[PDB]
Amino acid sequence: GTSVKPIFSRDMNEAKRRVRELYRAWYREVPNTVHLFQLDISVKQGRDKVREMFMKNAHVTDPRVVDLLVIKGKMELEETINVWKQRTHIMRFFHETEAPRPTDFLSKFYVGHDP
Amino acid sequence: TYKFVNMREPSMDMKSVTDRAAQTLLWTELVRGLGMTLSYLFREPATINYPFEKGPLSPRFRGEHALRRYPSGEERCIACKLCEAVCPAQAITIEAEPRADGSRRTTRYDIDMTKCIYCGFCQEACPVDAIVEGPNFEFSTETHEELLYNKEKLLNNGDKWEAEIAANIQADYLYR
Amino acid sequence: GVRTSPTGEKVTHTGQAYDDGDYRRVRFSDRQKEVNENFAIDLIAEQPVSEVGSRVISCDGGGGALGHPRVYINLDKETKTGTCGYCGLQFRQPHH
């Protein structure tokens, strides 16, 4: 039961197809984005960041969530291609100015009360 | 009712056509605008000689904040926290405790003037005329830190501006 | 009634003064510290006690609508004096 209305895909396979299309488009766009924005990162680590962002949502098991994430990624790609962003928006993906938050129990115990 | 702004029909008789042609060829309206500007040059300018001359103001004007006190010399504030509750910008911070003589008085009264919107809600919420918005407006500052007023600064402002503040309140209090 | 800290700072009417080991004193070096010279408690202590021949007196702080809300004070207790909750003025029945 639990009948719901499709957004774009009827099942998971079409969702995977759209995900692969978006990943292909991003993988093409990475070098041109790196050159045009005069970024200090390399193409390798930019594509690694794209891979990491795609892996961040690897646990989704619902076509509606999957293709809505695809829609948001397509919006981000459109923003990046049309040079609507500045270097700051692109560089925000890397968090180069944020201190590295430790994970072990001792470090969190020493720094403060935050688990 | 309604009017028409651009619903005229130009006359097509020979005299009107010749008049429009003369307007086109001799630039009559341009000369008329030139004459308007020339005439407007020969009239007295509206500039005042600041800072030696000041712009007109009103007893209702809202300027820099100040804390007042009674003629006996004790501060009017009783830490009711109505001004802090009504503040649209959350710019007032208040802490209180009983005094050495048991009076209900504040130990902390801060106003962040970089958050304040100068709406005057605090002085109209005050039940004892303690917090007011004085007539001073020439208090620009070279650093962000000096625009964070504490209780001592506000009491100093009250002692500094009490004469004008009292005169303005005497002028305007019958409208409140 | 401004006092001075043993280190050298002025003590405010709220009693605030940085202790010796406090680093936050560095904000006042090459500058000053804002302290109001008139203490309300001392100023209100100098006011004379009013003598009225009634058991209940009313106080509005003086000035009519320019004072505080009008309150009534009971003066039956001869041990102490009646003190206004807003203005701090003191009233007393004519003992002896």
Place this chain on the structure above:
Amino acid sequence: LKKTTGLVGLAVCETPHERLKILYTKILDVLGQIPKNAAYRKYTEQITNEKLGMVKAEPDVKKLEEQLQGGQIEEVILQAENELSLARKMLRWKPWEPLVEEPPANQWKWPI
């Protein structure tokens, strides 16, 4: 005939009675295919028949404007094509059928 109706983009239509009659005939023909019990069909038929009888009994154009309560016969004609297009779209939609489904239990409960 008048000129410059006063609305930008709305041109003057000479011989408007024929246009109104043709549009009303088309509207009635499209309404004929709708089920009889549909409220839309009977209501729009009543309105269209009223307007057609009104226009068939008045040769003057200004008196027709005053009687039809719309004024500026050109915009009445515009409303006529709007109604015709809506009739075709609604015949395609078929809204006389019962409600698709009820909302959840407290979908419209306010406050909270």
Place this chain on the structure above:
Amino acid sequence: EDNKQFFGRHRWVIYTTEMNGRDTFWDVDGSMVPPEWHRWLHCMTDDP
């Protein structure tokens, strides 16, 4: 004062050349006016 001037220019102040601790022959500003003359000078009242 000069009531024949238009509103705004009918009152003015000539600043002192030496206030509390600095030489104000050239460096004058509007914060040097005391509150009572501040009230009179900004036309908040008609009485000096």
Place this chain on the structure above:
Amino acid sequence: QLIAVDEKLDITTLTGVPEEHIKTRKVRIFVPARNNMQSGVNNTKKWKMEFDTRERWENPLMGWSSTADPLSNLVLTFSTKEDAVAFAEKNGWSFDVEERKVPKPKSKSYGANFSWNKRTRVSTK
């Protein structure tokens, strides 16, 4: 035209919440208790959702109270406990639910004040 998929709802990846503010927080689902200073009961009708309290420290300047958690002032209202539980589950927050406290009915009797032999007899009124 209908997927008819069967899986629990999860919108976590779409809300934009940071990673460490989802699985680390602990929301509380409760009916707020009546303020004992007053006898009114109008504030004990709905269900509230609030997050766990985090660190608050004193600002070195002005001595103000600073914070670092953006959810320190977030409070939500729900008609029933089920709605709050469903919202918390679909948003991915671990929750504790407290059952509503209802004042039990009481037997009041004005005549019990003036008792012939019972202890309920009052000394004054």
Place this chain on the structure above:
Amino acid sequence: TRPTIRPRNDVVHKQLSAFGQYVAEILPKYVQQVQVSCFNELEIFIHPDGVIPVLTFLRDHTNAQFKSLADLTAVDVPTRQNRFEIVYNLLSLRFNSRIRVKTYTDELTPIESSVTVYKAANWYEREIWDMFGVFFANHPDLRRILTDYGFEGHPFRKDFPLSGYVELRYDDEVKRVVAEPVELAQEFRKFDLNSPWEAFPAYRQPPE
């Protein structure tokens, strides 16, 4: 009712009730409820599938001809199964009246775009998507219109924090504006203003 009380108009109430009944009769497939408020406002509750038919009927019908889209917005109610309600405000110049149409949806169910019916709905639907995350199908170009580029989340949702999650500043080491987790020198003070002793008996709910 002495001068401090607002005057009530009976004629407009009856007219709006009659027109609501008329609209309900003509479109039973979608209309779920019709209401007229005590200050003479008519709002109509419809099923999500009927957004295009109802709007087209109200715009094009001779008796309605609501040619102007006054406003389109959304309201977030977390306690409902369908989280968001979509509100359309329409103005009729021919008959000098205003109508309201309400719809509902959740995070994952799209709503049909009404740009074909009203050209004004374009930026309104863009803003609804930006602020609430409600997707609109067959929209010409749906994208953020108000938030910053790369902004994550939808701020007008009730569970979004007031100050957000990230703040901006300039860093001299990287010579650019950077985004960092938000820290406030003074936390926003939360006030509990709601009082007991309910104010309006007419709105009292059953004790269930």
Place this chain on the structure above:
Amino acid sequence: GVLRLVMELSGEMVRKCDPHIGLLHRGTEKLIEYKTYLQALPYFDRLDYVSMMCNEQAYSLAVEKLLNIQPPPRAQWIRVLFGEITRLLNHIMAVTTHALDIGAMTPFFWMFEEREKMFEFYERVSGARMHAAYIRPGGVHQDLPLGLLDDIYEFSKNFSFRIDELEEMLTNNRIWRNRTVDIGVVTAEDALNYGFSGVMLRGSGIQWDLRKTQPYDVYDQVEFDVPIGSRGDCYDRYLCRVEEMRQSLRIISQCLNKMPPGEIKVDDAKVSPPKRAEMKTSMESLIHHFKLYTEGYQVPPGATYTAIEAPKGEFGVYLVSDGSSRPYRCKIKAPGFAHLAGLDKMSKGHMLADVVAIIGTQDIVFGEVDR
């Protein structure tokens, strides 16, 4: 204000024009939900900051409709008088800034002197030059000072000559005409469908004015004419705005002559705060002052959409009440939003220099567009 404008140009002609907004998005609607109604009032001053008291009036009317109360007659007359003054201010700003962008730049100063005088009126009535917060959801905060009406009459009897000088500089100038005539033409049907309002509607020949069809405060007790255009271009809209300035002068004269006596806020101390002397002498007045300035007044549950004829068009608010003293939702409708949305259509097949004229004739302020 500040605008980012991405466009495609084929030679001189503009093919596509895509405006990017949000550079002044402050999140006002979410901030309003954390305030009481009185606390949320000053946001409307900042929404459209050329016509402040008009936004105050719209919000006050919405709250009054939800509260089932009405302001006293003198309050309504004061509201309409200051709304017409604010309309004069807004039209001066719009016309002079449009001319400045074209390149005239002299009438800007000429009319900003008058704008300064009207700011003096604002400051005298509320103590603030622009964000007064004078119009409240129960009436007005304070009564006018004893000499204000005379000064308003003195100001308003010389403004027609200033408008005449403006027209002498701009109306019949051939450069101004060639800059504004047949630019940004919009049809009546497109204007209606695209959501336009105000002058943007009336320039195409549509006869619509919210002060006439749906009057709100006392606008049905004064008579004035509504300028109507014929070609739907920038020149017709400029003429309409000038004629609206003249009609505003007419309404100001009528308001000055017919000001009635009485109180200024509704005599209901559960909505409007009591006078200071009452608060300082009466127990009930003190209790009501305390509760009104700490918690605020509760508004019965319900939703309303209230619109007024603002100087820039139809300004509306969709206000939702949950029964508490804080609004549950407050949607703000700004005409500049729809006008900037239609900018793309209005600049089809025009020069690059005509986009500035179209933006000027749309009368766009980004505070209300972004909110």
Place this chain on the structure above:
Amino acid sequence: ASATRVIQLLRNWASGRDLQAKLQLRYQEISKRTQPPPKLPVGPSHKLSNNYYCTRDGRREAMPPSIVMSSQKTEKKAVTPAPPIKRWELSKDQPYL
């Protein structure tokens, strides 16, 4: 205005109007900055009797909206939301500009 006669004539001719009648600089014609105290009238509700608040309580007269055609629970002439708007009149004060 302390302007000479020749300058007044020149500016009047160049502008085309008589400026001295309507000057844009304020002079003694404005009101004085000090005013007498204002008495200020009380509201209608200031009665001592026959003034119970339950008879003048606007908020408590608000009611939930009336429900018509709740779906969960003849000639029949066609109707419109409101009578058609009357056409405006052509401003018999200045019909054309």
